[PDB]
């Protein structure tokens, strides 16, 4: 499934990501846009031999177990299949764990490059 700006925004506010550990909804909409283009089934393979899965392209060497990254740390303690669903539940709970580390949303390259220091509320302005 591919999401819309306002659609993703609403769903992420229903999943309590607005101001989770201080990060406003716009930050998450922006990050998701530049990480997967609102694609729930986006997959990207890396140099490690890992895969990035889902709306927020969560890595399989650190956060999920696919059975295809050996030595994964599975920090979100989840299968990577759950990050490829049309339901954003698992992606959200995992991103909440990722952001609850001291690095924060600096674990998402897109966010660092395209959202940090910008008016991210622009990504929710227009949505009701």
């Amino acid at each position, epitope marked *: 499934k591919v999401f819309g700006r306002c659609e993703l925004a609403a769903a992420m506010k*229903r999943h309590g990501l607005d101001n989770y550990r201080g990060y406003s909804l716009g930050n998450w909409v922006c990050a998701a846009k530049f990480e997967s283009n609102f694609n729930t089934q986006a997959t990207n393979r890396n140099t490690d031999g890992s895969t990035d899965y889902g709306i927020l392209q969560i890595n399989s060497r650190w956060w999920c177990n696919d059975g295809r990254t050996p030595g994964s740390r599975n920090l979100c303690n989840i299968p990577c299949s759950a990050l490829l669903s049309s339901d954003i539940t698992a992606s959200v709970n995992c991103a909440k764990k990722i952001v609850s580390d001291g690095n924060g949303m600096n674990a998402w390259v897109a966010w660092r490059n395209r959202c940090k220091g910008t008016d991210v509320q622009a990504w929710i302005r227009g949505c009701r």
Partner: antibody
Amino acid sequence: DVQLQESGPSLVKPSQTLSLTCSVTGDSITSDYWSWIRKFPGNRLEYMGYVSYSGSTYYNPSLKSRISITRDTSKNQYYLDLNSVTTEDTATYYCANWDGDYWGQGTLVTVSA
Amino acid sequence: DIVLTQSPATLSVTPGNSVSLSCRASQSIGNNLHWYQQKSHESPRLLIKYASQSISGIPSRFRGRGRGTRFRLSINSVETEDFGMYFCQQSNSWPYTFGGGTKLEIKR
């Protein structure tokens, strides 16, 4: 699967330092975030702190000046240090993962002279 | 520092009836409220995560409802094995805070 065990003194003297140990079997401590929680005699639970993957440690502001959470990958363990303990710090201490689904059995610590 | 107040503090129920437990927050916490059960001789047991999500194995008679500043745990057709303390916890802000508890007593 992970099994958690708290270990430490049952009697600590006031003004001294409390030390606890959470031993983890089943999975590495590099597979989760690990935390310390205590339950006071009045059935009041307090989240003491947690350590993340980068080594960032988050401490309750109330105890920030007296608490230190450390790790040992060599022994698959993490440790709690609470300084300047008082009689009000008598409680049952639990180590647990940040997910909150794997808990230890609890270790009772009485702070008394 | 979010303050969580739980109500009522103690409730007695005849097995077969439904109960609702309330957890109120001092500030909006979205859906980041978790419910735990602690019985005698036992470490806290996660029952509900992010305030409506189920946990594998936990009876479907447990229900989570709420978003924002007021949340609730419902136990429909309460059974005998549901005696214990019930705690709510937030995870939206640090420090992570708990509620005071609700002791459930089973009438017999």
